[PDB]
Amino acid sequence: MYQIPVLSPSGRRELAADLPAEINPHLLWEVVRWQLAKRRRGTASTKTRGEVAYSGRKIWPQKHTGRARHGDIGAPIFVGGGVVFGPKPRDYSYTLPKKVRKKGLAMAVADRAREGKLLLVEAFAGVNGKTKEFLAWAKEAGLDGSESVLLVTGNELVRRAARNLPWVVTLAPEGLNVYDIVRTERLVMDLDAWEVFQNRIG
Amino acid sequence: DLRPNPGANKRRKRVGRGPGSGHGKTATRGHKGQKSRSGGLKDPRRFEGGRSTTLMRLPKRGMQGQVPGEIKRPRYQGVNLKDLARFEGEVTPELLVRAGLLKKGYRLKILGEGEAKPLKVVAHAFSKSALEKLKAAGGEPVLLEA
Amino acid sequence: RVKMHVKKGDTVLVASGKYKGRVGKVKEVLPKKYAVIVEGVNIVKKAVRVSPKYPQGGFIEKEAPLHASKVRPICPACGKPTRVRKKFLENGKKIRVCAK
Amino acid sequence: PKMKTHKGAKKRVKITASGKVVAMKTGKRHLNWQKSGKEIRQKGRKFVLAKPEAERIKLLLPY
RNA sequence: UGAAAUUGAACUGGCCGUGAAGAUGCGGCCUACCCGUGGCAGGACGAAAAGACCCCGUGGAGCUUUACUGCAGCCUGGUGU
RNA sequence: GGCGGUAGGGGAGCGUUCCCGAUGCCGAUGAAGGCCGACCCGCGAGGGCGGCUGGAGGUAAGGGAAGUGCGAAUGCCGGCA
RNA sequence: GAAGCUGUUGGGAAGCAGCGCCAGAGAGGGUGAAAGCCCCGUAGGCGAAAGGUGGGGGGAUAGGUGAGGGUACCCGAGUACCCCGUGGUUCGUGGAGCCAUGGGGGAAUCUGGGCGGACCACCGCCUAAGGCUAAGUACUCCGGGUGACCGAUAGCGCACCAGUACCGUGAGGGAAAGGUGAAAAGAACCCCGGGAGGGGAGUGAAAUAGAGCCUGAAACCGUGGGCUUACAAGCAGUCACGGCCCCGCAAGGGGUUGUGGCGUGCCUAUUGAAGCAUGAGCCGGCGACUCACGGUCGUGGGCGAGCUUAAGCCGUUGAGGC
RNA sequence: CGCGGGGGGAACCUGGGGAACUGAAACAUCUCAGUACCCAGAGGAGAGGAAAGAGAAAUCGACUCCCUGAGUAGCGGCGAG
Ligand SMILES: [Mg+2]
Ligand SMILES: [Mg+2]
Ligand SMILES: [Mg+2]
Ligand SMILES: [Mg+2]
Ligand SMILES: [Mg+2]
Ligand SMILES: [Mg+2]
Ligand SMILES: [Mg+2]
Ligand SMILES: [Mg+2]
Ligand SMILES: [Mg+2]
Ligand SMILES: [Mg+2]
Ligand SMILES: [Mg+2]
Ligand SMILES: [Mg+2]
Ligand SMILES: [Mg+2]
Ligand SMILES: [Mg+2]
Ligand SMILES: [Mg+2]
Ligand SMILES: [Mg+2]
Ligand SMILES: [Mg+2]
Ligand SMILES: [Mg+2]
Ligand SMILES: [Mg+2]
Ligand SMILES: [Mg+2]
Ligand SMILES: [Mg+2]
Ligand SMILES: [Mg+2]
Ligand SMILES: [Mg+2]
Ligand SMILES: [Mg+2]
Ligand SMILES: [Mg+2]
Ligand SMILES: [Mg+2]
Ligand SMILES: [Mg+2]
Ligand SMILES: [Mg+2]
Ligand SMILES: [Mg+2]
Ligand SMILES: [Mg+2]
Ligand SMILES: [Mg+2]
Ligand SMILES: [Mg+2]
Ligand SMILES: [Mg+2]
Ligand SMILES: [Mg+2]
Ligand SMILES: [Mg+2]
Ligand SMILES: [Mg+2]
Ligand SMILES: [Mg+2]
Ligand SMILES: [Mg+2]
Ligand SMILES: [Mg+2]
Ligand SMILES: [Mg+2]
Ligand SMILES: [Mg+2]
Ligand SMILES: [Mg+2]
Ligand SMILES: [Mg+2]
Ligand SMILES: [Mg+2]
Ligand SMILES: [Mg+2]
Ligand SMILES: [Mg+2]
Ligand SMILES: [Mg+2]
Ligand SMILES: [Mg+2]
Ligand SMILES: [Mg+2]
Ligand SMILES: [Mg+2]
Ligand SMILES: [Mg+2]
Ligand SMILES: [Mg+2]
Ligand SMILES: [Mg+2]
Ligand SMILES: [Mg+2]
Ligand SMILES: [Mg+2]
Ligand SMILES: [Mg+2]
Ligand SMILES: [Mg+2]
Ligand SMILES: [Mg+2]
Ligand SMILES: [Mg+2]
Ligand SMILES: [Mg+2]
Ligand SMILES: [Mg+2]
Ligand SMILES: [Mg+2]
Ligand SMILES: [Mg+2]
Ligand SMILES: [Mg+2]
Ligand SMILES: [Mg+2]
Ligand SMILES: [Mg+2]
Ligand SMILES: [Mg+2]
Ligand SMILES: [Mg+2]
Ligand SMILES: [Mg+2]
Ligand SMILES: [Mg+2]
Ligand SMILES: [Mg+2]
Ligand SMILES: [Mg+2]
Ligand SMILES: [Mg+2]
Ligand SMILES: [Mg+2]
Ligand SMILES: [Mg+2]
Ligand SMILES: [Mg+2]
Ligand SMILES: [Mg+2]
Ligand SMILES: [Mg+2]
Ligand SMILES: [Mg+2]
Ligand SMILES: [Mg+2]
Ligand SMILES: [Mg+2]
Ligand SMILES: [Mg+2]
Ligand SMILES: [Mg+2]
Ligand SMILES: [Mg+2]
Ligand SMILES: [Mg+2]
Ligand SMILES: [Mg+2]
Ligand SMILES: [Mg+2]
Ligand SMILES: [Mg+2]
Ligand SMILES: [Mg+2]
Ligand SMILES: [Mg+2]
Ligand SMILES: [Mg+2]
Ligand SMILES: [Mg+2]
Ligand SMILES: [Mg+2]
Ligand SMILES: [Mg+2]
Ligand SMILES: [Mg+2]
Ligand SMILES: [Mg+2]
Ligand SMILES: [Mg+2]
Ligand SMILES: [Mg+2]
Ligand SMILES: [Mg+2]
Ligand SMILES: [Mg+2]
Ligand SMILES: [Mg+2]
Ligand SMILES: [Mg+2]
Ligand SMILES: [Mg+2]
Ligand SMILES: [Mg+2]
Ligand SMILES: [Mg+2]
Ligand SMILES: [Mg+2]
Ligand SMILES: [Mg+2]
Ligand SMILES: [Mg+2]
Ligand SMILES: [Mg+2]
Ligand SMILES: [Mg+2]
Ligand SMILES: [Mg+2]
Ligand SMILES: [Mg+2]
Ligand SMILES: [Mg+2]
Ligand SMILES: [Mg+2]
Ligand SMILES: [Mg+2]
Ligand SMILES: [Mg+2]
Ligand SMILES: [Mg+2]
Ligand SMILES: [Mg+2]
Ligand SMILES: [Mg+2]
Ligand SMILES: [Mg+2]
Ligand SMILES: [Mg+2]
Ligand SMILES: [Mg+2]
Ligand SMILES: [Mg+2]
Ligand SMILES: [Mg+2]
Ligand SMILES: [Mg+2]
Ligand SMILES: [Mg+2]
Ligand SMILES: [Mg+2]
Ligand SMILES: [Mg+2]
Ligand SMILES: [Mg+2]
Ligand SMILES: [Mg+2]
Ligand SMILES: [Mg+2]
Ligand SMILES: [Mg+2]
Ligand SMILES: [Mg+2]
Ligand SMILES: [Mg+2]
Ligand SMILES: [Mg+2]
Ligand SMILES: [Mg+2]
Ligand SMILES: [Mg+2]
Ligand SMILES: [Mg+2]
Ligand SMILES: [Mg+2]
Ligand SMILES: [Mg+2]
Ligand SMILES: [Mg+2]
Ligand SMILES: [Mg+2]
Ligand SMILES: [Mg+2]
Ligand SMILES: [Mg+2]
Ligand SMILES: [Mg+2]
Ligand SMILES: [Mg+2]
Ligand SMILES: [Mg+2]
Ligand SMILES: [Mg+2]
Ligand SMILES: [Mg+2]
Ligand SMILES: [Mg+2]
Ligand SMILES: [Mg+2]
Ligand SMILES: [Mg+2]
Ligand SMILES: [Mg+2]
Ligand SMILES: [Mg+2]
Ligand SMILES: [Mg+2]
Ligand SMILES: [Mg+2]
Ligand SMILES: [Mg+2]
Ligand SMILES: [Mg+2]
Ligand SMILES: [Mg+2]
Ligand SMILES: [Mg+2]
Ligand SMILES: [Mg+2]
Ligand SMILES: [Mg+2]
Ligand SMILES: [Mg+2]
Ligand SMILES: [Mg+2]
Ligand SMILES: [Mg+2]
Ligand SMILES: [Mg+2]
Ligand SMILES: [Mg+2]
Ligand SMILES: [Mg+2]
Ligand SMILES: [Mg+2]
């Protein structure tokens, strides 16, 4: 929806948004798949009847032998022989329409916001990469750890903080991906990062 | 919203048919049962039969080739004035190519149906009927030359 | 190379199983099989002996190898992890928060 | 990879703007000698071709 | 001491029918306790061999020749040497 | 009220291997698998429960990708008759 | 290279409980079983006397840079060009050019000479018959990283001392074969026995973990028991009745079969099979409709007179965007 | 007397030579294909490379490689390709 709870050193001023409302699960899904799809690296290999050390000679004359009938041992029906239709390496990715890419990211952030978890932040007293600081901030922020958080900030020091913290996941502003988003319970991002987010979709 | 329950909205269904099992599609494995069904048939579209294929037709299409290849002639992209009037201002090959119906084409020819709005239509070609609508309200910018 | 591990031949506590808590000085440490011999795991060998030379070999329940993961270095304070402080000229090792 | 347009077919048949297939009337060149004015005329124009049209389409596809 | 080919599973009888037209196995009827050792070779369309005969496949191969086409080789005009 | 059925087409589902679910959850008070069952649920393929073996793994709900279920191929490898 | 200690279950904790801690490290591996803090690592960070690599940074050297007029000296020869025979090209003789050249004729030096698909004109292009040239590209014997890659009939042929054993004159062909247990504590002594092997004792949580030993299925061989059978005729079962034996208080259920009823195996192939047509000894494991590109119809979703990006680039290290 | 060569290298590369099966539902042009293979040579690459080019734009401006152009132009017993 709209109105989002922005947190600052000056209190909890709740600004407004523009994100849509109608959350279409299927669409959201397609995107997520596309993600878990493009990362799928093809490495599974099975040397077919072709690439097998075995000779090319015929085992029996296939006549007046009393035996079955074959050529070389490279035949699949020769335990050890070439795989029949074994999967060879190949890409699993494609090109999901850009519109959808954004449409999802919108409905995504909009969903967790609509539920009431999109806490925009700014005041980061976490002077450096010292986890203690972060957990001390999150504590006074409303993040007792009972909810997995996606931390989107520009500062690389804030990374350090929740970087090791198990119940949280750091991420770049552009790193906004529909997977990790709909992969956590809470979403909390830097106001400045909410700006670049408004760039892709505002 | 959590990972669980995002799946296809009931209509993806990767229900790939398994042609061999014991029920549904068994021994023969999918529609077969006869012979010449193991490697592959002829084409068959356009091709087999054994006789003089339906390829009995005859090429009237002249200019059906030449050694030097293809001649270089001004390609004329026919554009309808109905879409032309949609946007108003100064319609030139520049505008129609940037967004419209030109696609790095060569020549532009306004014509067709619709009701030409009052504006300068800088085209390379004009239909006799197309020269009427725009002459009832507007100007007729012809092409270049050199 | 790199085989080097925790302690050596000194004062050690056993936090393993059948001899948990027990303390003892480690007399042997076999890097290959990554194990140390203290005074803990001491099982009985019935065997007379593999080499006929010297009649009686012993029904000895002698010291047995023990994984060098369950033994721990120690000092005045009982049971501490290892830290290394390059001295003023050499390379010595300090325990948790004390010397050597 | 990439269907290859059956040139032979294209050089002798062009597809309509709708979903039909058209070709020149057959038997007008060789056999000719003195066939009624009707013949040579009826053989001048073109025609539709029913089922096999669906086949020929499956050739000049990228076309 | 210790094989073999073979082997759907067997609780594996005769006759007259019968059946894809030559039944231990289906009908009717007649015989007929269970198990084996030695011997014969009529049946199990006995075993072995995806019939050598025959036909079919726009299969394969060797061979012939005034089948086609082509090559070596030989004859020959011009020509360079 | 329809519901014999081969070639066929169409529909629904079961199980197998891996993936997200997982920094989770089940698990030595016993994992996977093996053995038994006259119990339970399902039309079914299967699923569940109980005893026994076994000794360290296993993996819901909801989704995703396949080297995905064998009785035969004088099929292949092995073991035994 | 930060951070753990007590108790409890157990043969054994890392499980379970109590209180605490680090975290630029909660990747993974191990430790007697399921450990951020016990061990090896991880994040981050430090390092070379010798060798190799090394314009990325710097310096130096080689080489090279101007106008107008006249002269027209020079500008790649058995070459161009032409013809005969051919190769390359999309070009199969075709209106056949261009590039190359086997045979023959055989030239000029900018008023030169090739070319823009026969050929001519016109217009424009380009300087043949000497040579050199980084990068972007190919590959993977080799080292590393990762896997909706295999997990010993898989995966390389080979996890194991394998291109071995073995087969072939030879070229060449080419296997099978992994696992005790946390620890070897791998069984002292006694008993029978020539030995192998067992039996008792001792080890272990466990010895139907005792040594090609984890799990240990099937075919297959065997011992004990219950039921059954020597007047019987059969695709071996199925329906009923009865008797025997076995679980339950009962009703009931299970195992077995005496008698009666009914009854032509499976697969394939066929007009048609139990067929005296095919295939199968038996078991267990291996085994056959896929993948890429393009097309087509259906379908879910986005967007709509528009829809969509390709290579690649920036980013990351299982983030996307341009 | 000095400088160099010889030979080996999984794959990759240029050059010299170069099939047939197969397809055309026969087959001989055509196809497979400059593929397989042989031989020589090079190197971490090779090849190629500054125009006697391209081609219709009084346009580009070495070579190489990717996408595209395009299954287009065109080639073809105008068959298969
Ligand atoms: Mg091969
Ligand atoms: Mg081979
Ligand atoms: Mg070999
Ligand atoms: Mg072969
Ligand atoms: Mg071979
Ligand atoms: Mg072969
Ligand atoms: Mg061969
Ligand atoms: Mg035969
Ligand atoms: Mg294999
Ligand atoms: Mg193999
Ligand atoms: Mg294999
Ligand atoms: Mg793909
Ligand atoms: Mg696909
Ligand atoms: Mg696609
Ligand atoms: Mg994290
Ligand atoms: Mg919701
Ligand atoms: Mg719907
Ligand atoms: Mg059916
Ligand atoms: Mg079958
Ligand atoms: Mg068949
Ligand atoms: Mg037939
Ligand atoms: Mg075939
Ligand atoms: Mg014209
Ligand atoms: Mg013109
Ligand atoms: Mg309109
Ligand atoms: Mg203890
Ligand atoms: Mg006629
Ligand atoms: Mg006329
Ligand atoms: Mg037989
Ligand atoms: Mg048989
Ligand atoms: Mg009888
Ligand atoms: Mg009878
Ligand atoms: Mg006797
Ligand atoms: Mg006898
Ligand atoms: Mg005899
Ligand atoms: Mg006989
Ligand atoms: Mg035959
Ligand atoms: Mg023939
Ligand atoms: Mg022949
Ligand atoms: Mg000759
Ligand atoms: Mg029915
Ligand atoms: Mg019916
Ligand atoms: Mg069917
Ligand atoms: Mg299903
Ligand atoms: Mg959940
Ligand atoms: Mg994980
Ligand atoms: Mg499993
Ligand atoms: Mg189980
Ligand atoms: Mg069941
Ligand atoms: Mg249970
Ligand atoms: Mg047990
Ligand atoms: Mg169990
Ligand atoms: Mg899983
Ligand atoms: Mg398979
Ligand atoms: Mg079957
Ligand atoms: Mg079999
Ligand atoms: Mg046989
Ligand atoms: Mg056999
Ligand atoms: Mg066998
Ligand atoms: Mg260290
Ligand atoms: Mg440490
Ligand atoms: Mg305390
Ligand atoms: Mg737990
Ligand atoms: Mg130095
Ligand atoms: Mg050096
Ligand atoms: Mg450099
Ligand atoms: Mg300097
Ligand atoms: Mg200088
Ligand atoms: Mg100088
Ligand atoms: Mg100088
Ligand atoms: Mg100067
Ligand atoms: Mg100058
Ligand atoms: Mg002069
Ligand atoms: Mg010159
Ligand atoms: Mg010369
Ligand atoms: Mg000269
Ligand atoms: Mg010329
Ligand atoms: Mg010319
Ligand atoms: Mg010449
Ligand atoms: Mg002469
Ligand atoms: Mg001169
Ligand atoms: Mg030119
Ligand atoms: Mg010319
Ligand atoms: Mg011309
Ligand atoms: Mg002139
Ligand atoms: Mg030159
Ligand atoms: Mg590359
Ligand atoms: Mg490696
Ligand atoms: Mg490697
Ligand atoms: Mg696996
Ligand atoms: Mg596994
Ligand atoms: Mg193997
Ligand atoms: Mg041992
Ligand atoms: Mg003993
Ligand atoms: Mg013994
Ligand atoms: Mg003994
Ligand atoms: Mg003994
Ligand atoms: Mg024993
Ligand atoms: Mg057991
Ligand atoms: Mg055991
Ligand atoms: Mg034993
Ligand atoms: Mg041993
Ligand atoms: Mg043994
Ligand atoms: Mg065993
Ligand atoms: Mg084991
Ligand atoms: Mg074990
Ligand atoms: Mg057993
Ligand atoms: Mg055994
Ligand atoms: Mg017995
Ligand atoms: Mg008995
Ligand atoms: Mg018995
Ligand atoms: Mg009687
Ligand atoms: Mg009786
Ligand atoms: Mg009877
Ligand atoms: Mg009783
Ligand atoms: Mg009782
Ligand atoms: Mg009772
Ligand atoms: Mg009763
Ligand atoms: Mg009873
Ligand atoms: Mg009863
Ligand atoms: Mg009963
Ligand atoms: Mg029983
Ligand atoms: Mg009967
Ligand atoms: Mg047959
Ligand atoms: Mg027949
Ligand atoms: Mg039939
Ligand atoms: Mg029979
Ligand atoms: Mg039979
Ligand atoms: Mg027969
Ligand atoms: Mg037959
Ligand atoms: Mg047989
Ligand atoms: Mg046999
Ligand atoms: Mg056999
Ligand atoms: Mg057999
Ligand atoms: Mg089996
Ligand atoms: Mg089998
Ligand atoms: Mg399979
Ligand atoms: Mg399969
Ligand atoms: Mg497709
Ligand atoms: Mg169509
Ligand atoms: Mg469609
Ligand atoms: Mg579609
Ligand atoms: Mg729709
Ligand atoms: Mg649609
Ligand atoms: Mg709809
Ligand atoms: Mg739609
Ligand atoms: Mg819609
Ligand atoms: Mg990460
Ligand atoms: Mg992973
Ligand atoms: Mg000298
Ligand atoms: Mg030398
Ligand atoms: Mg050499
Ligand atoms: Mg060399
Ligand atoms: Mg090569
Ligand atoms: Mg070559
Ligand atoms: Mg052919
Ligand atoms: Mg023939
Ligand atoms: Mg041929
Ligand atoms: Mg040929
Ligand atoms: Mg060719
Ligand atoms: Mg060549
Ligand atoms: Mg060549
Ligand atoms: Mg060489
Ligand atoms: Mg080069
Ligand atoms: Mg060169
Ligand atoms: Mg041109
Ligand atoms: Mg590239
Ligand atoms: Mg291309
Ligand atoms: Mg023809």
Residue nearest to nucleotide G11 (CA to C1'): C18
Two tokens at B36? Answer: 């010449």
* Nucleotide with smallest C1' distance to residue A64 CA: E49
Cβ-Cβ contacts under 8 Å between A and B: the total is 22
**Please, which residues have CB within 8 angstroms of residue B35's CB and are 6 or more apart in sequence?**
none
| DSSP one-letter code for A83 | B
Q: Tokens 């109905």 map to which residue?
A: B82
Do the Cβ atoms of A26 and B8 come within 8 Å?
yes
Question: Residue A42's Cα: distance from chain center in Å?
Answer: 17
Beta strands at A149-152 and C66-67: parallel, antiparallel or unpaired = unpaired
The C-alpha atoms of residue A109 and residue A118 are separated, in whole angstroms, by 7
Closest by alpha carbon to B78, among B22, B31, B123, B144? B123
Asked if B69 and D35 touch (Cβ cutoff 8 Å), the reply is no
**Please, which residues have CB within 8 angstroms of residue B62's CB and are 6 or more apart in sequence?**
none
Answer whether A171 touches B (CB < 8 Å).
Answer: no
Using N-to-C axis directions, what is the helix angle for A98-115 and A25-38, rounded to 10°? 120
Query: What is the number of alpha carbons within 13 Å of residue C98 lying toward its C-beta?
Result: 10
Burial per residue of A104-130, b for 16 or more beta-carbon CB atoms within 10 angstroms, e otherwise: bbbbbbbbbbbeebbbbbeebebeeee
Nucleotides of F under 7 A from a protein CB: 7-12, 19-23, 61-69, 73-77
Closest by alpha carbon to A35, among A151, A177, A157, A134? A177
Q: Tokens 């931390």 map to which residue?
A: A151
Asked if D46 and D25 touch (Cβ cutoff 8 Å), the reply is yes
**Please, which residues have CB within 8 angstroms of residue C100's CB and are 6 or more apart in sequence?**
C75, C92, C93, C94
Handedness of CA D17, D19, D20, D23 (dihedral sign): positive
Within A1-49, strands assigned E span 4-5, 14-15
Beta strands at C11-14 and C23-25: parallel, antiparallel or unpaired = antiparallel
List Cα–Cα distances, B80 to B74, B88, B120, D30, D56, in angstroms: 19, 14, 15, 45, 32
The C-alpha atoms of residue D50 and residue A161 are separated, in whole angstroms, by 73
Asked if D13 and D24 touch (Cβ cutoff 8 Å), the reply is no
Q: Which long-range contacts (CB under 8 A, 24 or more apart) does A96-104 make?
A: A96/A30, A96/A31, A96/A34, A100/A27, A100/A30, A100/A31, A101/A31, A102/A200, A102/A201, A103/A27, A104/A27, A104/A28, A104/A30, A104/A31, A104/A32, A104/A178
Closest by alpha carbon to C40, among C57, C22, C62, C56? C22
Do the Cβ atoms of B60 and D9 come within 8 Å?
no
The C-alpha atoms of residue C45 and residue C60 are separated, in whole angstroms, by 6
If you measure from the C-alpha of residue A55 to the centroid of ligand 163, how many angstroms do you get, rounded to a whole number?
29
Four-CA torsion C86, C81, C12, C78, nearest 10 degrees: 110
Using N-to-C axis directions, what is the helix angle for A131-139 and A156-164, rounded to 10°? 80
The C-alpha atoms of residue A37 and residue A92 are separated, in whole angstroms, by 6
Q: Which residue of D has its CA nearest to B53?
A: D52
DSSP A160-199: HHHHH-TTEEEE-STT--HHHHTTSSEEEEEHHHHHHHHH
Closest by alpha carbon to B123, among B115, B136, B134? B134
Q: What is the resolution of this structure in A?
A: 3.2
List Cα–Cα distances, D45 to D20, D31, D42, in angstroms: 16, 17, 6
Asked if B122 and B90 touch (Cβ cutoff 8 Å), the reply is yes
Closest by alpha carbon to A119, among A146, A148, A136, A141? A141
Closest by alpha carbon to A124, among A156, A151, A158, A149? A158
Closest by alpha carbon to A56, among A82, A85, A84, A88? A82
* Nucleotide with smallest C1' distance to residue B19 CA: G289
Nucleotides of E under 7 A from a protein CB: 6, 48-50, 58
List Cα–Cα distances, A177 to A31, A107, A168, A184, in angstroms: 9, 12, 15, 12
Q: Which of A23, A29, A111 sits opposite B7 (nearest CB)?
A: A29
